[PDB]
Design a binder for this molecule. Structure first.
Ligand SMILES: Nc1ccn([C@@H]2O[C@H](COP(=O)(O)OP(=O)(O)OP(=O)(O)O)[C@@H](O)[C@H]2O)c(=O)n1
Ligand SMILES: Nc1ccn([C@@H]2O[C@H](COP(=O)(O)OP(=O)(O)OP(=O)(O)O)[C@@H](O)[C@H]2O)c(=O)n1
Ligand SMILES: Nc1ccn([C@@H]2O[C@H](COP(=O)(O)OP(=O)(O)OP(=O)(O)O)[C@@H](O)[C@H]2O)c(=O)n1
Ligand SMILES: Nc1ccn([C@@H]2O[C@H](COP(=O)(O)OP(=O)(O)OP(=O)(O)O)[C@@H](O)[C@H]2O)c(=O)n1
Ligand SMILES: Nc1ncnc2c1ncn2[C@@H]1O[C@H](COP(=O)(O)OP(=O)(O)O)[C@@H](O)[C@H]1O
Ligand SMILES: Nc1ncnc2c1ncn2[C@@H]1O[C@H](COP(=O)(O)OP(=O)(O)O)[C@@H](O)[C@H]1O
Ligand SMILES: Nc1ncnc2c1ncn2[C@@H]1O[C@H](COP(=O)(O)OP(=O)(O)O)[C@@H](O)[C@H]1O
Lengths: 534, 534, 534
């Protein structure tokens, strides 16, 4: 068994959906019965994404092994059944850190560390590492062709293409075939130049992807084929669509995967894409509609809550119901008040970092709780709900986290070391998929149909425990606890129609094919409530 | 007085309106009291545009001196008063013809004729020729930057620029800033690369033109400025508009001309663009509307009748009336019949070549004539009308032209040498602006308010005097005769509300500010008819 | 006062002598009375040059402030009297280390750290730092134009050229105009392309340097001028010569510096290059010649002992005597023996790290000592000489250094902490220019004509004073000691015609115009001995 590789690059303009295209392909390759995986290389100097804000790049994906990574790794999880790990994504800065450390340790024995070799060697080794044991490995190259930000990576690839042999590697390239209304037609010249640029750095494209807002005419595809030294059959058109789960269908329709198996001499069984065909059918034919309002902070950039948004979608798919998302700034609920929260069927409060308008988040939690409006809390949102309930039911005035107020006097959230009561009596970070003990009598236990459940985490502060007993005894159900320390993983409100809040991140586990019990329940509750409020 | 030059190039995609931008600038420069002119270099092997069809490139402009040239030369005539000549436009093929001829006759004395320097010499000498005696010369380079089709021209320019000095030259480069709805924003990357391409061939841009369907944000303009080595104030945004006549206003708004005179150390007077402001006001505030139907052949690409369309628009401007042009295929009138011609306020028949469904054109002429529907015929449209009237009123069975049916028997149109009667008894191309003697008692004489007029021509066959007397005596007014041979330049129908047809090309003289008597009359009559029918 | 900058780049091939050219220019501009400084940007990933071997890049330059840097910084010291510091040279690796550390510290506040703008800003800042307070700053750009290894730097430069303004910056570029004997002529094509490459990254050259083995014809220079958009007067020819001290003369001859002052509007006084002319005269007219053996380890690459070689040259210039260096592998002395050392007028042993042929080095020291042959030892050579004398005169069997033998038994060299005697009783790196106390009665005190001196260091181990009294009392002169702990700096042999050795690196202070007492004495001694033996 020899591993085959396909490299994916993009030129002309960014924002073409390189990760989406690659993921859609991978889904097909999976559907062809092939051991396909995928990795993404980034042109960033930041070593880890944890040093950047969500407004800067959107939500940071949490892998099973706890690694923080590029959002697109979650996108990969939404197309194939393999698991992403730290080996599936790294940055330019990461490379330098490692190489410079090797320098420091004398690993280059007095030699000059150059871009070529050494830096490109580091890259090559990482690629071989991640692709080990797989039939097909897709590699997404971040950055735009022609920009200096990723030339080292492009070079490392070229080297490997030669080292490995062209019989085990293909060059895929995304372009833009923009529509010029003034002329009344699309243009292909930008594409022609993008290809020329790849050629100037030692790369000859094998497969072309024509991104546009409309199908590109065969004639134009032929013109491209001519100028790029590419067979007409390898020039694929990809018009804009209203769902990424329809793309596998399109790629299959144009015979892309057949071409690929032919190039790799693979005996590939007919792709079974019916899983997504089902999803598409259901997606395009919902029986109902609900409105969910989301109160947060980074709502000016949807990408910041991308994983959440898609998780909501997945719940809606299983319940055949349209999901509307109201973007609400917590600072406005703080300012304007709960009038914002009117006209909603359900309330959503996501996680994140930053005090900002958290008091408006608390206000919202109170609103949903007090008015019995289908409430879902995640990470910070749970902490918010904890505070809400604590202050108004358990009467823990000024309940808060020590991360914002050193002496809350009611620190409902704190570090384990920092656990303490209101009288000052006392007694790092949790990341990745961890097993939680569900309470057999809780809804969540029954939602998963299991005593325990493994879910992803990303957070430093925990439920106090010293003051927990005040909150829990006041009338709050701990629906599940962690492992060794039995930490409050998830809660439910005794008399609320649907109120669930948790520490884990279910949004990184939901799929379009499986959905996810908590979003299924949440969205359903929204519908129930909606019908009740009529 | 030393001539200053500005070169115009464009990259990324074609069809950005290089001629439009250049003409708009020139208009402003004229408005500032500067002696401005303009030339265009074309990347084609065709020596003369007369060897190509109307559908291939659209209408071929006829200059005063009879030269056949690029449509854009007519566009230049519509913005500045400087008259174009054969020296204002030539092609790659033209150059080679000249150079090879010089080789053949020994002008290079045994030397090797090379692109560099001999082809570039042909080019730069022609440029200096055309720019003689002018303050500012705009030079438009056709083709797209990065393509081999025009690299010789770009090289000739580079050399020239060095020779004359930077104090006498500026580089204006058009680009495209495409809007990507999927991202919700415009991109600049393509532009950055386009500039890099010019730089790679020795050209550093001074002024950037950002074509788009919307204003480009100052921030984006600044980003471009950075990467292109260009001052922010020299980065001009140019969004799509509904009228070319509004462009001078936009360029003026962004201070383009001030920059230019500063660069050329010229004490330039403030631009008076009120002439176009008037036009714009009138254009945007017509008092009425009218439907004009046009029957022809090259309607599958409006460019073929561009000069006509503009002329109709100009008539509309003077009569504050919207002109609605219906495109009708002569072959459909031939097939379907006159039902096509219903719902029209007036009918127009353009010139051109090709028999095709001209019988339907004749049918149309008959229709408009017999139903008293305002009619305007140009060149071929006159030939058509001549046949119509001759065959159906003067009883000239099979009235026709020898260019299609030599054995006509009633050749109403024929080469002067070919003039003959129905008994076989007998007795190149007219080009450019020629004097026409108008009949003092004709409407056209009074429409122009002058004994004679001067108008452009292009045709080979003439009205057959041998049979003319039958037609004219039957009841048709010859509204004007040429000169030496008193050739029927223009006719009018005695009892038709407004039926005028002529040999000359009034559409090459009409401007948005001056208008033109025949379009003023036609369009007005069209409106009048409409009102008479309502 | 505003700082002016000149950037120096080069392409086509490596090894053109960019640093040499820049240094020669600086010398002229020094002679024009300008505040000239100079920096070099190192494309390597190594953070410090200390992590690379002498064979990898030759000798590593020691700056006054103790920084280790590129050899060319010493070359700068040999053309201008200003002082280099850590601010005059840094690497690519250094940049990343700094930036990543800033990232780690939260310096970019959650933003994406990108090459553009963050890496380039790091560069920009360092350039402004080093050039602060100077009239003219030369900046040598390492690497080769067109290679990805230095594109980030080239970009940072472009940006600064724009932000600073062209009135304060120039682009100088070295090329190769190779001689093609098969054709019988030189070619310019490579140059034309090199320039095009700079242009493609936003850089337009102002000054061209044509490296070759012969003067380039004015015609060819004109051809280049044409294709590069450069004035003929700015195309400088630079043929190969037998001395780098003749280059200022050549550059002056072609009017380079005048051009520069005109570009910077400087009223520069006529260059006084007579000091260099003197050096040249003396160089080209020695009255004698001597042969000096150099016993070492890195002799396979001259560059490893470059600073030493030049120091020897300078001594020869002052004594009008040719210096013939015989490179000798100390390992061959171990194999073949002292027969290698025959036919020499003087013996020299350079510094360095590694055992290899050190025992042979000792054998050589012994040979020169015992046979009264003008000996000069530096750093390691001193350590060697110490062992020689100690073992063979002070009877310190196996006199040695703890850097090679944990239990030397007679550790004549050791870390200060490691100082111990032969009975086991006891009691980082010295860098940069340090004050040494000379013994008034020593030869070197009188050679320097001063009580104390300041000289550069680069070593960790010291003379073990526990056993010094054995060595010194046996009959050996300590000619100088250091500071606080009076560490042994210089040793002289009581009855040897001329045998000295020292801890410091005099080769980093020697200049072509000033010379250096030590090397003057050494080379002189060689001559004296030569005559003594004749
Ligand atoms: N020749 C250059 C110029 C720019 N960049 C890269 O250009 C990118 C900027 O373009 P893009 O990522 O697409 O986003 P913006 O900078 O906002 O601009 P645009 O989308 O128009 O390119 C930066 O990441 C920078 O690393 C580079 O590497 N090489
Ligand atoms: N590197 C190349 C490749 C093609 N061409 C030019 O590429 C142009 C094609 O683009 P364009 O003129 O805009 O029209 P089309 O050929 O239809 O294609 P498109 O509009 O997409 O460029 C042709 O004119 C051809 O002369 C060239 O000169 N040099
Ligand atoms: N397109 C490339 C190719 C090479 N390198 C760099 O090229 C340098 C090597 O070239 P050079 O210094 O000239 O020496 P060699 O590699 O030995 O080969 P040569 O001298 O023939 O160029 C290396 O540092 C490598 O990082 C690069 O940056 N970009
Ligand atoms: N970018 C350019 C520049 C020059 N030329 C070609 O450059 C050649 C000149 O180089 P070459 O034939 O090698 O001889 P010379 O002109 O004498 O100069 P050289 O040999 O140094 O190139 C000319 O034929 C000319 O056609 C060209 O086609 N494209
Ligand atoms: N053909 C498609 N239809 C519509 N937009 C799509 C399609 N495939 C790609 N995209 C869009 O591309 C974007 C991907 O964003 P981003 O993560 O920046 O892309 P990339 O993977 O290229 O970095 C999404 O907004 C997605 O809607
Ligand atoms: N900003 C503008 N608004 C709208 N379209 C414009 C504008 N400027 C350029 N164009 C369009 O560009 C086209 C010019 O066609 P063409 O003659 O091919 O241009 P070029 O001069 O670039 O060859 C026209 O259809 C015109 O409407
Ligand atoms: N014109 C000149 N005459 C002879 N050789 C020269 C001249 N200018 C440069 N050099 C040579 O250039 C070499 C410089 O080597 P190196 O330091 O590797 O170059 P760089 O500093 O460009 O990397 C020396 O061997 C020197 O003799």
């Amino acid at each position: 068994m020899t591993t085959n590789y396909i490299f994916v690059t993009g030129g002309v303009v960014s924002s073409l959906g390189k990760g989406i295209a690659a993921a859609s392909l991978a889904a097909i390759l999976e559907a062809r019965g092939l051991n396909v995986t995928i990795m993404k290389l980034d042109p960033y100097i930041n070593v880890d994404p944890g040093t950047m804000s969500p407004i800067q790049h959107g939500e940071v994906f949490v892998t099973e092994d706890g690694a923080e990574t590029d959002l697109d790794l979650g996108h990969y999880e939404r197309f194939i059944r393999t698991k992403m790990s730290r080996r599936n994504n790294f940055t330019t800065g990461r490379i330098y850190s490692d190489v410079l450390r090797k320098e420091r340790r004398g690993d280059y024995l007095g030699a000059t560390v150059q871009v070529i070799p050494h830096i490109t060697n580091a890259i090559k080794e990482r690629v071989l590492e991640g692709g080990e044991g797989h039939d097909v490995v897709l590699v997404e190259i971040g950055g735009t062709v022609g920009d200096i930000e990723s030339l080292p990576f492009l070079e490392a690839i070229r080297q490997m293409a030669v080292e490995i042999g062209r019989e085990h590697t293909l060059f895929m390239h995304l372009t833009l075939v923009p529509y010029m209304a003034a002329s009344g037609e699309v243009k292909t010249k930008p594409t022609q130049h993008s290809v020329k640029e790849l050629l100037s750095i030692g790369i000859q494209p094998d497969i072309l992807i024509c991104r546009s807002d409309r199908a590109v005419p065969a004639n134009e595809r032929a013109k491209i084929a001519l100028f790029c030294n590419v067979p007409e059959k390898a020039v694929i058109s990809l018009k804009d669509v209203d769902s990424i789960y329809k793309i596998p269908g399109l790629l299959k329709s144009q015979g892309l995967d057949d071409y690929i198996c032919k190039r790799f001499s693979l005996n590939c069984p007919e792709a079974n894409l019916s899983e997504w065909e089902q999803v598409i059918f259901e997606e395009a034919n919902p029986v109902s509609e609900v409105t969910i309002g989301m109160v947060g902070k980074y709502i000016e950039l949807p990408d910041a809550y991308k994983s959440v948004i898609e998780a909501l979608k997945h719940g809606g798919l299983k319940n055949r119901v349209s999901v509307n998302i109201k973007l609400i700034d917590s600072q406005d609920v703080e300012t304007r008040g709960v009038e914002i929260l009117k006209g909603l069927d359900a309330i959503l409060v996501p996680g994140g970092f930053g005090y900002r308008g958290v008091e408006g988040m608390i206000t919202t939690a109170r609103f949903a709780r007090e008015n019995n409006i289908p409430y879902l809390g995640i990470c910070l949102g749970m902490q918010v709900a904890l505070i809400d309930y604590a202050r108004h039911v358990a009467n823990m005035e000024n309940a808060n986290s020590t991360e914002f107020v050193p002496d809350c006097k009611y620190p409902v959230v704190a570090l384990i070391t920092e656990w303490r009561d209101e009288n000052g009596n006392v007694e790092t970070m949790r990341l990745g998929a961890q097993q939680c003990q569900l309470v057999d009598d809780s809804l969540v236990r029954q939602l998963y149909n299991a005593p325990t459940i493994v879910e992803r985490h990303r957070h430093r502060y925990e439920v106090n425990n010293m003051l927990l007993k005040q909150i829990e005894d006041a009338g709050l159900r701990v629906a599940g606890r962690s492992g060794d320390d039995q930490l409050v993983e998830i809660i439910e409100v005794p008399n609320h129609p649907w109120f669930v809040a948790c520490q884990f991140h279910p949004e990184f586990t939901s799929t379009p094919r499986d959905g996810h019990p908590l979003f299924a329940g949440f969205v359903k509750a929204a519908s129930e409530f909606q019908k009740r409020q009529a």
